[PDB]
DNA sequence: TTGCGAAGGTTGTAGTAGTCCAGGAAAAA
DNA sequence: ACCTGGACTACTACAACCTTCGCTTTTTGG
């Protein structure tokens, strides 16, 4: 065989390769050789060149196989000096000549711009009615208008367009500037008449584009929401919209007549308004093939929702700006809105319409630049550094798989899973994996959402520590979501002025803890210089709760969905402890995931107890969303193959899928493999069933007996397990329960009873009814004092608080217990020598089990996890028993509540996630807990017989149901008894006086009557630990935050409670206890 | 817009790209260049000249709208490459935006009948001898240019050629008459310009400035005629006057309509003034534009087919 | 037939030969081209190179006639750079060494 | 906020050969 | 008065980056 060898080395590498090669071939050129050689010679040449190669070596070998044919065999050294065929570049340069930043790929930007601009110019036209003007000039008592102004605007537009006409007709008519005249108002089918005329959205009333514009016109303050819910008419939307849907309040005939009067003509008089409308109509007419796209555009969610977002934002921004005489007719009589302070007319109607249209035009060209100009996290060494601990190598494996799959995920999508078992530190894995996907040149962005109602600050800082990110790169959204009805009263008060678009995007309580760059915001103009929105958008990495992002799709009023929606478009998403959600809140999570996939994000669930039905439903939703997006972005025509992946602490895999069945098969295979591997591990916990003894159903005496039995259990179990040091034995306990009232009652009982003989007990109550700052301090102390390891007796005993407690004690045995609430399940990296768990659901049993001996290896083989035979609710004779929390429901009853019969006895010796991550066949919903849970999940998530609703989730993307707020009502989110926010506020003039005040509409009203003091009694050798000083803690927080003490108490001292007539009783160590 | 009938626009010093689903031109003069008033519809065609580039996305959008695209040379001539026009028949009815042509059917409907070809050749010759008169006599700008055309001799030669053309039985006689008229016109122009004795060297071997100017004008006119046939939709091979074997016959037949009436004066004027190549090229382009040649070529080509079908 | 072309040109001649040869073959190196071609195209290549050649031009063409055998077709310009078989000297020195 | 490619001038680097000085070798089965 | 390697020293060919500036091309067998 004859071959051709070419070298492209440099510096000393050149001399070496010249030396090695010149032994085999005659020199045909300064860097070229060619000669007939045998195979053995070639192999030895490759070996020799490989042995002594350097960084600057690049040698290629071509084989002249036969006639008119030659192939590249191999390249030794650097492969960036040649392409695939073995050619070499001719020239090089640094100055960019591709200049690929000028052209973007938003294939529907122009349609959105035209629809929005046309919708803007007409949206507030209804504010010309005499009734509206009188209300504007009326200073006395306000009367709610018989008709919403948006509905009047829609009726005016419908009258102008003329029923039954094709699009070109009205388009041309509007575009012709000469045409003027009020002769088309005779067709204004008023809705005050005795016979209600047909709805404007019916088939024979408007052409397609007319309906597309009309929807934006009418839905720019609140979504339509009627009473009908038949799925048959849902698929026919937006036809069945009628005057009732849009809040047509009932009033007397005089007012209804008074609304449909226009004594002062219309805005058509203004020359600038007419000229701009004519220009927009001409442009919309000249666009290629827009007319034939009407029907398709009407039933597309992406376009319509992006347009509505743009319009809402522009309208909100301009409504706040001051008057300007430069736009429109300087002497136009009509007006739009007054001033919020002086109560005087501020803007002219035509001026307002023109300004909103201008701003919408300006913004519509900014969205494509957001991805390029916004801040990003790049070149972070922490996510790139390797890990030496062998327990943390699977993290490196997953990180490597991320690079392996990065390329195709950028183009087709991503849907990742994370099934690593507890204690493996999933947070760092999630950070590293998500970073790896993002392009290294530009950086990374993503957000972390926890399935927790409230996010305490210490949790966010713990996330910072685990990720190792400075305070300049991770924002924290403290607090919880607000109530819906609180904003209503001010809105009705603010409706006196017609400035409903000026409401703040976010609630007042929420604060964003961030201190990074804030001056170069591309969207700084509209969102506010320092409002919470801009801070939220700037931060490269965000930590929040899912309740703070859900308003993206679940919002029904106002503009609460602007900031979270922008966040979704511009970043990525990570969901943590999703299965922590209640069963009836999963529709909302599915809708959020669908929209997340619809706008170009990339989802990554994370938990260790994901039942198959949930994962299948969520994948189907994400794919349904992703399919729509690809129509309007990227290269058209490419297929829809999501890039799924599975990740845990044993191995890693990734594959491309495009149908639910293939995904399901691959997931089933991976879970089977994981079960096979998991089965070989040695157990660390040995459960047991404990039979409670009950004589009477009275809560007090029942609690007394329960504490009496618990004390004996404590003595016995501490005798079983303990850690000794210099003749002293101590242990760390856990007493989990279901509800707060029984929890506090048990705490009081145990405090009264006192510790057993020869033992000392330290108690630390810990639930969600404490003031938020106090709860954060408690959690800080517990996290500090509950880190364990091997052969650390001296180190642990060297800890300050433990040493202080022991020094002033005369006993030889001590007991430290954490009488926690379900809040201990999520986000707590503790470790306890033992536990006693009340049964509510299988997920709780597994998650609490993972706590025991989290960090300490070895096992004596003795039982260290008791279980109550029956839950407290059963002892009280409540049917169903496993409810709130729980899955038992009237439609899914359970024969026997006893735990002896509801749990397989084999599982006792080994408790893990195996029973949850797979679905047994056959299912026995009436006997087995896991069977019941799997049955409910399968019925609701994917099956077509969802209990009590009969409304399948796929309705959200199988029918145009997002054009109307219907599904959000039949499957609400976090529904139930309303809650109210309270707080302990010091007196304005006397800091030493603390008042119990309620949160009114932006003001705190004293409610000191509702509060009362409760007393405590103690026993022998019993004391509390981990408690906090409320006043001192508040002072400390105010000092750290450089804030007024009262303001700090307002911001952080919030506490939520359920309404009670008789009030509550308080103690700094127990929190708030209901009183009757 | 080179021709009102064709609806053909010319673009230069511009980058054609797409931003958010719309084709956009970036050029000096910013958002005031009149390239923004180019209707993108079935009835448009784009020709890109000096200093221009087109992206793949832009041509996807243009194809979606139904606009042909072609790359011409400096000033509009010659044509380098372009799209192709499909035919329109009862069968062969694909669904696409591009508007098809119908003149290929009518053209092929007579090209196989020798006598009809003879009639067509007569029409072409008549058009040329007609336009020569207007160019060489009526042009006041040409009269002020300097080369002096004697009415008597030109009229005598034109009348003699007209008599000869009307009485040509076969193609060879028509070719001989064409050669005679060409030689006589050459001589008349040479006398008018005072250039002296001149000839049309073969292979373009002539070293005198007149030879170079004549070759360059010829090249420009051939380019223009190629544009003409492409716009209409006829093929180049289907010659009418030339022999059936000579490739590109139709281009030269159509090009001859304007060559002897527009190129000939300009070459001698430039030689007399001794100008450079660039100025001569600019002058030729200016004269072609003012005379509105392309419109005349298109009109004549359609008229031939109309007459052939009417007489059918 | 497939051929291998090596350019030893110098100074201005380098740019010219690079311009001409780049129309016919892909570059396998800083001064190496190699692609299949027919006899007529090769003759055109040689003629074009000869026409505009300069004093420094030096180009050689080898033919892979078959299996384990190759031939030198021609050289354009100075043949002092290449030896009879077409190889090239590895180094030069003004200092006499042979003596 | 603004085309495209060529020609001339300037700036930086890798690569080549001459000079002089010093050491003189290859390790199974 | 032997023969290579290495370190050191000039000292040119290459290549790219920065400014202006004209915008064609022989055009012939068609």
UniProtKB/Swiss-Prot annotation, chain A:
Signal peptide: none
Domain HD Cas3-type: 102-318
Keyword line: Antiviral defense, ATP-binding, Helicase, Hydrolase, Magnesium, Metal-binding, Nucleotide-binding
GO molecular function annotations of the record: ATP binding; helicase activity; hydrolase activity; metal ion binding
Covalent S-S links between cysteines: none
Chain ranges for the short sequence motif DEAD box as given in the UniProt record: 576-579
This enzyme's EC code(s): 3.1.-.-, 3.6.4.-
Subunit field text: Interacts with Cas1.
Protein name: CRISPR-associated nuclease/helicase Cas3 subtype I-F/YPEST
Native organism taxonomy: Bacteria, Pseudomonadati, Pseudomonadota, Gammaproteobacteria, Pseudomonadales
Gene behind the chain: cas3
From Swiss-Prot, chain B:
Cofactor section: Mn(2+); Mg(2+)
Binding positions (Mn(2+)): 178, 242, 256
Domain of life: Bacteria
A Gene Ontology BP annotation from the UniProt entry: maintenance of CRISPR repeat elements
InterPro entries xrefs: Cas1, CRISPR-assoc_Cas1, CRISPR-assoc_Cas1_C, CRISPR-assoc_Cas1_N, CRISPR-assoc_Cas1_YPEST-subtyp
PANTHER family according to UniProt: CRISPR-ASSOCIATED ENDONUCLEASE CAS1 (PTHR34353:SF3), CRISPR-ASSOCIATED ENDONUCLEASE CAS1 1 (PTHR34353)
Protein name in the entry: CRISPR-associated endonuclease Cas1
Classification of source organism: Bacteria, Pseudomonadati, Pseudomonadota, Gammaproteobacteria, Pseudomonadales
Gene designation per UniProt: cas1
From Swiss-Prot, chain C:
Domain of life: Bacteria
Phenotype when the gene is knocked out: Infection with phage DSM3 inhibits biofilm formation; disrupting this gene restores biofilm formation upon infection with DMS3 infection. Normal biofilm formation in the absence of phage infection. Decreased production of crRNA in the presence or absence of phage. Disruption of the entire Y.pestis-subtype CRISPR region disrupts crRNA production but does not alter phage resistance (possibly OLNs PA14_33350 to PA14_33310, plus the flanking CRISPR loci), indicating this CRISPR is not involved in phage resistance.
Family from the record: In the N-terminal section; belongs to the CRISPR-associated nuclease Cas3-HD family.
Subunit structure: Interacts with Cas1.
Protein function: CRISPR (clustered regularly interspaced short palindromic repeat), is an adaptive immune system that provides protection against mobile genetic elements (viruses, transposable elements and conjugative plasmids). CRISPR clusters contain sequences complementary to antecedent mobile elements and target invading nucleic acids. CRISPR clusters are transcribed and processed into CRISPR RNA (crRNA). Cas3 plus Cascade participate in CRISPR interference, the third stage of CRISPR immunity (Potential).
Protein name, entry field: CRISPR-associated nuclease/helicase Cas3 subtype I-F/YPEST
Source organism: Pseudomonas aeruginosa (strain UCBPP-PA14)
Region of the whole protein represented: 1 to 99 of 1076
